[PDB]
């Protein structure tokens, strides 16, 4: 039941069609935005049309487009010109095939490829305050007709698509992250180890994230809690250095361990949007208001990379924390934590139909 999206101008000249909102960086390639454009060679003055994307850091505002931007910085940009013609054919993909038996003789396919060196999709949600904190990566397609390219560019004459560039890659193979650590507390013999493991590296949104904990107290103080928690961080690395940092999760567990005792726990963890819609300053993948948003997918730098292009560096770990105290009179508390850092990705995306381009709201 293979759906297309479709969005035209006001000035209906110029209309694009899709094969998806989303387009899927695979770490080592990116899929490429391929469409067409229908045209009303008669609507256009004798004009040419034109196709870009644009990969734009805003700061300041929560849109590229909008007045009122502190800062905004073009990390891509490529144009092509589907009318007239100019020739270069290209092996159609299914999906300009199928447009174009529909849309008939005035559908001109193009493609355009993403760069490698490009970040995903990300959005940093503001605090309700600090409105001018919103930053983010946005991807633009924009269809336009004109005489001459000096020309202004009129919002009639024009069609903006807000597609997103997401993060795919499989679990299977990787590490299990692991983390120890011992500390004997004065007057302690022996010292409290704990344990932490992940099954993989790599998660995907919607996927539990089992932690499996382990103590062994032969410490003389008593545990009295064992937390686990994701933890996202922010770098923005454009314009200014904001750091944020959230729990995305968090499950406790008040089961003592004993001096002279041992303890095995697995916690399940799902750091999903959904259980974090109330929170700000946080790293989206998308606008708030839509429900394909996900939380932030883990930043993968890239050897030789200029940190910067990301825009947003994002990371996530899980945070295992004993809290420790003496059984009476001294019951000065102490924390003993361990970290493991994880990837956070979004899940592989698996006749014919036209939706409108706007995404699905919340």
């Known amino acids: 039941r293979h759906v297309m999206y479709k969005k035209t101008s006001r000035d209906k000249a110029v209309s694009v069609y899709l094969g998806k909102r989303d387009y899927v960086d695979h770490v080592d390639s990116v899929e490429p935005v391929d469409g067409v454009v229908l045209v009303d060679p008669d609507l256009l003055k004798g004009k040419k049309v034109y196709v870009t994307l644009t990969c734009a850091f805003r700061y300041g505002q929560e849109d590229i487009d909008v007045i009122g931007l502190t800062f905004r910085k073009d990390l891509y940009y490529a144009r092509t010109q589907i009318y007239p013609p100019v020739e270069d054919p290209k092996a159609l993909t299914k999906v300009q095939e199928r447009l174009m038996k529909k849309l008939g003789n005035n559908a001109f396919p193009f493609v355009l490829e993403f760069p490698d060196f490009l970040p995903c999709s990300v959005s940093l949600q503001p605090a309700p305050s600090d409105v001018g904190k919103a930053c983010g990566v946005d991807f633009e397609i924009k269809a336009f007709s004109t ?62 994230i089992t932690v499996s904990v382990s103590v062994t107290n032969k410490s003389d103080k008593t545990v009295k809690k064992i937390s686990a928690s994701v933890e996202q961080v922010s770098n923005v690395v454009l314009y200014s250095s904001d750091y944020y940092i959230k729990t995305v999760a968090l499950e406790e567990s008040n089961e003592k361990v004993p001096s002279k005792a041992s303890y095995n726990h697995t916690f399940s963890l799902l750091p999903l949007l959904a259980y974090n819609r109330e929170k700000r300053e946080i790293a989206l993948d998308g606008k708030l208001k839509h429900e394909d948003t996900n939380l932030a997918s883990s930043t993968l730098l890239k050897e030789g990379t200029d940190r910067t292009v990301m825009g947003i560096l994002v990371d996530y770990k899980i945070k295992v924390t004993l809290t420790v105290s003496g059984l009476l009179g001294d019951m000065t508390s102490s924390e003993v934590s361990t970290e493991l850092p994880f990837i956070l990705m979004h899940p592989n995306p698996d006749d014919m139909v036209f939706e409108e381009f706007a995404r699905d709201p919340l």
């Not at 000096?150 to 795919?168: A, F, G, P």
């Open 147 to 208: 005489n001459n390219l000096e020309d202004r560019i009129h919002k009639k004459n024009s069609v903006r698509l807000m597609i997103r560039k997401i993060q795919y890659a499989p679990d299977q193979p990787g590490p299990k992250p692991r983390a120890e650590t011992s500390w004997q507390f004065f007057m302690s013999d022996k010292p409290l180890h704990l344990t932490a493991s992940l099954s993989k590296e790599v998660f995907y949104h919607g996927e539990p």
